[model samples]
Target: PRYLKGWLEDVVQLSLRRPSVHASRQRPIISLNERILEFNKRNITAIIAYYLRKSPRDPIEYAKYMEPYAVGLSIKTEEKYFDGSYEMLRKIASSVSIPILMNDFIVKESQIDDAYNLGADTVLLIVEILTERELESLLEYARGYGMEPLILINDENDLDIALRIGARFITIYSMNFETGEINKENQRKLISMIPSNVVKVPLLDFFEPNEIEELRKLGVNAFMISSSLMRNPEKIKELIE
Candidate 1:
């Protein structure tokens, strides 16, 4: 049930095939930074995103724009494309005020050092790619760096791993990334398995408003809203409230 299969190369390929899949795929008439500032002024909580590798479209500009909103950057860990070089990552950390999550395939202790040196305040220790022992060890090491590890869970089985590791912050995916379909019952069961102390942050991928309400009832504390909100800034204000 736990597995880390995606790679940055995979993302690049996917992006090539579906060019507009990324939140920044379409050039906004207004800069993303300005958009983020305006969005935050309306009281939105946070902005989380992937593919932090450099682009002609500089993310630093976006980060500066998102300063008021507490934007968090997630750089992918897969070996495929630019999972982001260590130097590049350090630059990003130095440039941004908000915490950076090393969104990579962290299956070993060495990866932890890389994240720490890169100046990440948060590291994503995903359940899919690590054994129970590996997960626990990594979590302990991560804590030593004063970094909060956000365990990413895809299913109930992964939730068990998270509990064993004593992870208090987590991201739960409600859809099959490969299929683009919602599995509501499975997601609900996974949510039920979360402990009270662990903060429940639901990932809003292809999610409906009713689903958000349902998750709130199930004890979800926060949400990671992506392109959906980027597409409709007006709606983002409503969702944040």
Candidate 2:
């Protein structure tokens, strides 16, 4: 199983080298992005797993074990970190037939192009950081380039923006990062409000296996399993199945 923190470190390390300007760059970028876009268009519900290492040794085997609905790779940019991790991720994406979401803190247009260049079929846009207009513009731009945005909504305000933008996939967390309590009532209400066409992804931190059935009863089509499952693959498989 790949840990999220380890994978994040790898992304930070890889972003250092500048992207190539020569011939080999075009084909890899186009092929990777196209492959990812095609998978998402199929609209399959998935359990996306994370890997946090420079070289993920068994991603193919890990995918098989998870039977993941999709795979998401996260990346970030800071002064000390580079984008070298994409090399390993590219291999992992190619090996799997499922879709891939590029998980990143996207604050700039440059990041959008970067994600597409790295072969992401989908990209995450967090509602907490972006304004409603920014979110809409970014989503439009991303779609023009054949990338879909999976909006992460932490509160009602975020959900409002998601609806306005016509988001097809959305993620909501149960615990407020600032206040650590289960937000059952609010989450349930939010779930009730979302449209049927939009897929709901609840973070696993607040919900247990039994709670999943309840959420499913509310019309949730998918879930996001993170390091908790990455650490215990077999247990996750049993629960999800």
Candidate 3:
């Protein structure tokens, strides 16, 4: 790893200018919106998430923190590890070039504001954790505070409520380690059900290169890569190429 450098988001930018580059159907959701934040874009979004699990080893603390695309940080409430402190996210937000998304088990509506003030471009709101009422209310709260909400769902039932609330973007965990895999048949059905404009982010433990283009054709807008990307930082740029 003596010398390794490459283009990621920039490639997406170039692709936008060259439609032919996207004939494969995936637009390259980098990690964005409003000002066309640039990082956030499509199926072949070239996603690069820095998994910030709670652990003694912190990339940000040591100033070795780095990634190619946008940043995703989580504070899993049930399983604590390192610093769940809001300040941890703050440091990341101020330091990173791309936007930041706060992934957490958020119960209190107040947490959205906490995320906004911490410099999060958006916050993940799991429909499974919140009642229909809370999910919708929090979505509104996040927007009202100038932050976007990326809704996460595990079933068609959640999809129904999410659409009812007019969600613009939704996230799906391809498989749940604890609950078993979400059936592909059911997943396809749900993806087809979403409004054409609403983006679907399929969060995967690892990027399965073979399935990417196939899912894009199925209308998945983006993919969230976690845990895996951390192991092979070199792969981030390679995947984009």
Q: State which candidate has the highest lDDT.
A: 1
lDDT by residue (tens digit), candidate 3, 180-229? 35566566677778887786777665557777777778777666665676
lDDT string for model 1 (81-196, tens) is 54445555566667766656676656666666666655666677767666788788888998786665878788878898799778877777755655545566777788888986
Q: Which 10 consecutive residues of model 3 have the lowest summed lDDT?
A: 19-28
Candidate 3: misplaced stretches above 4 Å?
A: 1-44, 48-50, 54-57, 61-67, 71-83, 174-185
Worst 10 residues of 2 by lDDT: 21-30
RMSD of each: 9.4, 7.3, 14.3
Compared with the true structure, the alpha-carbon lDDT of candidate 3 equals 0.58
Against the correct fold, how does model 2 do in TM-score? Answer: 0.68
Ranking by lDDT: 1, 2, 3
Best by TM-score: 3
1-241 per-residue lDDT for model 2 (tens digits): 1112443434433433335322121223232233333444654434556543332225556655554534343322222332234554455456655556666556556666766665556677777666778788888887877666778787788799899888877777655543434476787778888997776766664246678778878877666666565577665545534
Better of 1 and 2 by TM-score: 1
